[PDB]
Amino acid sequence: MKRIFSLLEKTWLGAPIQFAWQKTSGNYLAVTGADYIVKIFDRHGQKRSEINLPGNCVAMDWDKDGDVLAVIAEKSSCIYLWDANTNKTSQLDNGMRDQMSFLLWSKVGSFLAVGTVKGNLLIYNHQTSRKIPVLGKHTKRITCGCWNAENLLALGGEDKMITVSNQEGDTIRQTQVRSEPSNMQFFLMKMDDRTSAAESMISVVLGKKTLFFLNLNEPDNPADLEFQQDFGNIVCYNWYGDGRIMIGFSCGHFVVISTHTGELGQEIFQARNHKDNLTSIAVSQTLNKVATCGDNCIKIQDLVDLKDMYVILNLDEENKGLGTLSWTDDGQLLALSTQRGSLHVFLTKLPILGDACSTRIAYLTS
């Protein structure tokens, strides 16, 4: 495994950078820093597009197609819609004019959910280009959210309350939680009956220390999980397998827990991959492997054998402080951000093209 290219901008230096790969294609990568400019690069390492912003950028995300990317900025009520097919940037006005904080896409449909600190919510239908405003979704700052296979929008406010609704904006379930929700994700439970194929129950991280499960089927029995205080604060968690959660901590310890009935929160295997700190964890189904970055080192291990050590990389001292690890939908490219504003792209997977005439051979390296 070899790194393809490193992105280092002087403006990005000294400040964290947020990056997002195009979904299902990985052709475009949008990276932002503290310069109010979001740059979209190709897989070659060269710039493809640039977006100017009037305020600090928040985050990026991509739909199933990946053609439509919304660029967002703080202290602004306009969304910069960028079309990858023509690489053209236009401005969309929501008309609600609030402290916009959160941007997300529907994981199946072309629905764009936008939320503000004031709690106002808007749903944008790209197929019909229709705007549906829903007011009073939350009474405090919205943290994050998730979408299911049936286009159900889940949201969680800093007032410690979670709203689950449909794509039409009608509130379906309202639940109270002990701490501030973070990292909401939809997923499908696998019981003995395969007739249920809809993602219904939501896993969230409260206070970066506890795990909470809210079930739409049984809202009267929420599930709570608590981890050891020695591990620290929850950085990020990923879903893989038939209901398996891999949770990373600030002390370099990862916990794998199954979600089968009667075994929720039961640890599978835990180890101290990073001696001091773990920065991020990325799980790839196509690679079927997990890459954990921390202490300026990246360890990629097979998901089948978590104890097996596949790829070890020791980063340079100039990359002190890492950000997040993100994998393209095909698992071909893995990108890592740094707290100082430097990005790295690694060729984790690549199609196997090769031939041989006599003893001479040729093979696809990058």
Features:
1 chains; 366 residues; mainly beta; 4-stranded antiparallel sheet; WD repeat-containing protein 19
Tell me what you see in this structure.
The protein is mostly beta strands and 366 residues long. The chain is built from no helices and 33 strands. It has a four-stranded antiparallel sheet, with no helix packed on it. It comes from Homo sapiens (Human). It is found in: Cell projection, Cilium; Cytoplasm, Cytoskeleton, Cilium basal body; Cell projection, Cilium, Photoreceptor outer segment; Cell projection, Cilium, Flagellum. This is WD repeat-containing protein 19. WD repeats lie at residues 11-51, 52-92, 95-134, 137-175, 273-311, 317-356.
Which secondary structure elements does this structure contain, and how are they paired or packed?
Elements: E1 2-8, E2 18-21, E3 29-32, E4 37-41, E5 47-52, E6 68-71, E7 78-83, E8 88-93, E9 100-105, E10 111-116, E11 121-125, E12 130-134, E13 142-147, E14 153-157, E15 161-165, E16 171-176, E17 181-185, E18 202-206, E19 210-214, E20 223-226, E21 234-240, E22 244-249, E23 253-258, E24 266-272, E25 280-284, E26 289-294, E27 297-302, E28 311-314, E29 322-327, E30 334-338, E31 342-347, E32 354-357, E33 360-363
Antiparallel strand pairs: 1-31, 2-3, 3-4, 4-5, 6-7, 7-8, 9-10, 10-11, 11-12, 13-14, 14-15, 15-16, 17-18, 18-19, 19-20, 21-22, 22-23, 23-24, 25-26, 26-27, 27-28, 29-30, 30-31, 32-33
PDB class: transport protein
Keywords: IFT-A complex, tulp3, cilia, transport protein
Entry title: Human IFT-A complex structures provide molecular insights into ciliary transport
